[PDB]
Amino acid sequence: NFVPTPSVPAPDIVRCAYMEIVVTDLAKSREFYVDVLGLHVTEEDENTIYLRSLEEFIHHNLVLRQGPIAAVAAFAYRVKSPAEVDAAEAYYKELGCRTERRKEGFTKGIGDSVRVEDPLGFPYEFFYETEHVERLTQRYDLYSAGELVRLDHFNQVTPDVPRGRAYLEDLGFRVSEDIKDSDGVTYAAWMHRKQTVHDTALTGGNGPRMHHVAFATHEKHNIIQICDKMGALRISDRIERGPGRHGVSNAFYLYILDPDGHRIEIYTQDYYTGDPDNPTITWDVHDNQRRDWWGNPVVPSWYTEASLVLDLDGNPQPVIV
Amino acid sequence: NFVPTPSVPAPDIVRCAYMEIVVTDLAKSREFYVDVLGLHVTEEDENTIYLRSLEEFIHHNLVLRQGPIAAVAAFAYRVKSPAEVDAAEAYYKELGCRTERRKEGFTKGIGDSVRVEDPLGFPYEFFYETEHVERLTQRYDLYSAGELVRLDHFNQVTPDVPRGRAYLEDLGFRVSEDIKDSDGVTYAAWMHRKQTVHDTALTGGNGPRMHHVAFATHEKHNIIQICDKMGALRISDRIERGPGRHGVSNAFYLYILDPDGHRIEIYTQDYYTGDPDNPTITWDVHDNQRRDWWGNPVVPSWYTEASLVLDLDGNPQPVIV
Amino acid sequence: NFVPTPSVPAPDIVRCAYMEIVVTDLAKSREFYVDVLGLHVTEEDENTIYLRSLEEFIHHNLVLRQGPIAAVAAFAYRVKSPAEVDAAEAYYKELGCRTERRKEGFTKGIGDSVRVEDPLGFPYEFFYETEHVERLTQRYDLYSAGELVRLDHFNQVTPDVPRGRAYLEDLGFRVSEDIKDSDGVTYAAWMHRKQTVHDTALTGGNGPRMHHVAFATHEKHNIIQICDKMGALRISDRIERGPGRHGVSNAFYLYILDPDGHRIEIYTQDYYTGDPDNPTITWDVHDNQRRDWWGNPVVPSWYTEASLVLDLDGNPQPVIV
Amino acid sequence: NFVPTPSVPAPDIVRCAYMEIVVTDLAKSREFYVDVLGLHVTEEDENTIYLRSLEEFIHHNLVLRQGPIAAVAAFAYRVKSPAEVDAAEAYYKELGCRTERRKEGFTKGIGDSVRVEDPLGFPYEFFYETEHVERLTQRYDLYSAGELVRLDHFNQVTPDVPRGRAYLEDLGFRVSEDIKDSDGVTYAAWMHRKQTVHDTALTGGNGPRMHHVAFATHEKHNIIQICDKMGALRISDRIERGPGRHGVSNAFYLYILDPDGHRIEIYTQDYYTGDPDNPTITWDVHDNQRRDWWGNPVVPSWYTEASLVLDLDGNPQPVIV
Ligand SMILES: [Mn+2]
Ligand SMILES: [Mn+2]
Numbered sequence A, B, C, D: 001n002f003v004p005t006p007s008v009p010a011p012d013i014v015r016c017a018y019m020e021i022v023v024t025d026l027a028k029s030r031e032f033y034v035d036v037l038g039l040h041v042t043e044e045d046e047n048t049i050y051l052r053s054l055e056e057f058i059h060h061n062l063v064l065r066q067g068p069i070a071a072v073a074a075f076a077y078r079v080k081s082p083a084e085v086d087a088a089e090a091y092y093k094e095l096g097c098r099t100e101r102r103k104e105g106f107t108k109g110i111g112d113s114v115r116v117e118d119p120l121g122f123p124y125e126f127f128y129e130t131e132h133v134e135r136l137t138q139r140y141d142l143y144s145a146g147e148l149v150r151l152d153h154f155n156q157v158t159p160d161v162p163r164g165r166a167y168l169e170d171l172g173f174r175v176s177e178d179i180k181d182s183d184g185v186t187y188a189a190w191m192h193r194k195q196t197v198h199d200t201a202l203t204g205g206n207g208p209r210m211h212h213v214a215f216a217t218h219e220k221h222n223i224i225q226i227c228d229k230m231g232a233l234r235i236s237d238r239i240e241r242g243p244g245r246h247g248v249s250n251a252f253y254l255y256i257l258d259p260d261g262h263r264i265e266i267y268t269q270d271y272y273t274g275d276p277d278n279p280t281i282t283w284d285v286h287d288n289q290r291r292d293w294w295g296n297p298v299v300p301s302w303y304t305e306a307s308l309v310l311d312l313d314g315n316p317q318p319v320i321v
């Protein structure tokens, strides 16, 4: 059942920082992420595109890499100092996980990093060093009507949520909201290191799979404009669920699908979770409002489709059904 | 087939002005319309409540009347001058419709009025005189987060839309948008006297029935707040459809159900239709975007449920299936 | 004092439609109106640019023409039918005003038109025919964060407001709001033909001069984004007054200056004025809130700077001080 | 010159948490803070009112206490754990500052606390324990149009900013933005413990004085509604500055004055400052955009008026001019 708790301290994680996504047609994906969504290109080449949101100063929040199979190559977290990359390496080695360290980084603009196949089969990366680039916070001359301003969280699908939760708590994540039954069993959990509702969340299901990566906008009208632009471009069929308001997290949300089917959440409205005794909100598994505060109808694909993730050799991790 | 065109001129209609609805439990309805939606009470007694929106100066936009069967007693249009009330009476008399004129009005605050059972079975009222009340436009001290600022239109369900359309064009309504097939047959039409997309619209289906009455908010966030409040009050199951953006009319919309099941549309975003040659926008019956610009899933009840309307004796008009 | 009331009927005016502005450097002005403000180019040549707002279907709302002196060449109103152009010509001829008729129009995309040097010295144009162009209402792929969606009104500066008001009332404009003193003398007036607060307004001052031309946005955040973009482009010194809320008209506003100093108002939030007995709101000349609902400080240039207007020969009208 | 750096560690501060202000007429203040601004009353008695913002779970963000002289009695910061209250006491004791520890708290709902007259003359409180109350985040049934959702920061006026800055950096606050001259001298600094731009800021001027306490709204339209409501209530002369956008901090802001003249900032739009190497943004003292991104005119009172602060005996600290 439970992942053992190492005797070495967990690495001090600051926040989720970026995700590396493999796409099958780079030009088609570039059209979606840059021309439709408006993400900012930090740099690109024939095979990879480095994108960042408006208020980011690190090198990128998303890396799109062309590959033969659409999948997620890495969920990356920034750690507090260089020594924490060492700590992350030691922690996972004690758990017996495969680890790979590259002083020069795995993606451009990132420095010394360690990638690991974690206990739940996910490719996690921990890094501290990264090139700083121009922070576009006040470049209102580049601000689009649907501007994505920051990367907020990842959502992972795994078969055993209680095992996943205890493992992430040992890593230092705290639970801001969870869904449990009368028995006290955790069905899903929102976990954070930074002061928003979450950096990652665990959803029960066949896995390991990536459910979605999420960006925030400043206000609700920005999310509506994304829908409107998609309708004008005749790609409204890529709008999967939303807009709506989730009861869990209180987020005003929208889920859309990229060309390979990877799910992107765009939401707005966070609340502060930084206090040491921030109250956990537990939702009952039968409370309808947990999914949708407004009662919007259920979208089946949202519970069944999710992206494959890769092992450190670049091959898909088998999905446990 | 087509209603005959009278030889007397049509009354000069300015805009839709109010609707009289019969509710089965006035206190339960008062809670929804006043405590939940925030409409302003002009006056009320044991059996009837007169409500108005924020920017209205005439006596009321809605009259709620207690009765044994939930239904709509009257669709009321304001005409241009006192003489037009005579015109409306003469016009319908020539069509052979039952008319009833009351110099003192049918509802409080309204003067000389004529009500008719129109050719499609709907109770229409035409009046000019009305008591003026405090226009609350700048009473920001009363402004709620989901404030309804003005009454915009009615939507009617009738079995033969081409007959209804030609009948309303003779009355002087112009078509801003319609849905037609390749054969050029009209399936639905949006018709207006004032300079917005419509004062009334015709939907094909079993009728005569009232599909909805609609109010506008100033901005999109006001509609979102109505949803959030209903979720907090635990009546999100009364949210029927939306929020969404209609392709036809371009409205950002929300449809909710009152305690008796009468459908209220709250929407925002109009466009100007006042020019004499305002282009009619014709949508193809197979274009999915005409219903939802964002492709939101269809909601069955929206196409089957609608409210009964009353004849001039106060009895429901039989529904033609 | 008063302009005589002609014995021939006034032309039936539908709304203000466009303004022809002379600029001294076309490329500099194009940068402002198109690159900064985002207006849509209908067509252009070496000497003139035809622009329209998002929801317009007539050929243009603004014509920028290069010339030696920055000034306003024409305030154009669309009339109800072709016969009304004849009516406009006859009406002004009876007043003894100079008139010039061109069956082929004075600006591209406009047909039979009559221009007149009106009694207050303004170059007014009346036309019906105009080429229709693609209405961009639902082109959300072109929608900018600060999108100007429609042309709403003109504001004119004239030395004798009571004379100007009585003359515009004879033309059929109604007063929605005015500013008067205890004596009952009109200091300024908002006048309309269409169903918003105004198509034109009269401000007392040295004239004839054009105070501003105004465009509406859908919501308040669109106006804030214009400010933000101007700050990022380092041209915030062209923001003259606002954002604020006017007590008169209830508009959330912003006034900015183009390269030649012509004033452009961008506002949002109208209210309906279409009923025949729409109550006039009279503000007292000493009520502070009439200028600014929020008490924002007075901006002196707003009361002294305004654009010159041209006579029908293209020469500036002398300003009466 | 510089405050000495103690040899004991600084207490681990999480965020600014509440301010205790003394008002001269509690009922008049209650009307402003509760009836006008809509803050939520946690509890109150004849002499004191405890208020909290929408998303707060600790007992209060503001304590209003009736007293003979309007002033600020305490700037309170929540620390990470009970042991940190001991740390704060030891730390200030080593600086030679007067401290007062109360196991039972100084205000209701707060536990073990230490208050100090800090080196710059300000009454700072550090506490960990506080009673939790219903977090109203999703009580949309209570949500007003101008809802204040969370307390964000304090702003302090002090004559020697470089001394104050170094003192706060030793306490562990990091600088997100500062204003410096060519000589590299600090004129003002924005300092934070939590992940927003600041928990407190230092403004040069006669002090010690409290410049403002700030609350955030979810969106810009909420701030606009506060202005509109104040204009409707005829207290727009209490709006001191804004709405505007600050270049420093990037906040869309509004400053208003309570009945005793204490300055409240309502703002929205934060950006994330949590990374260990978050880039400090340094603004030049001559850059006009640092104050107002839109170039709004300067408001003199903003630079001269500020609130007195009290010593631990409840007497005003003399202001150094
Ligand atoms: Mn999510
Ligand atoms: Mn409708």
Ligand SMILES: [Mn+2]
Pocket: C153, C155, C212, C214, C265
């Ligand atoms: Mn104006």
Ligand SMILES: [Mn+2]
Pocket: D153, D155, D212, D214, D265
């Ligand atoms: Mn501040």
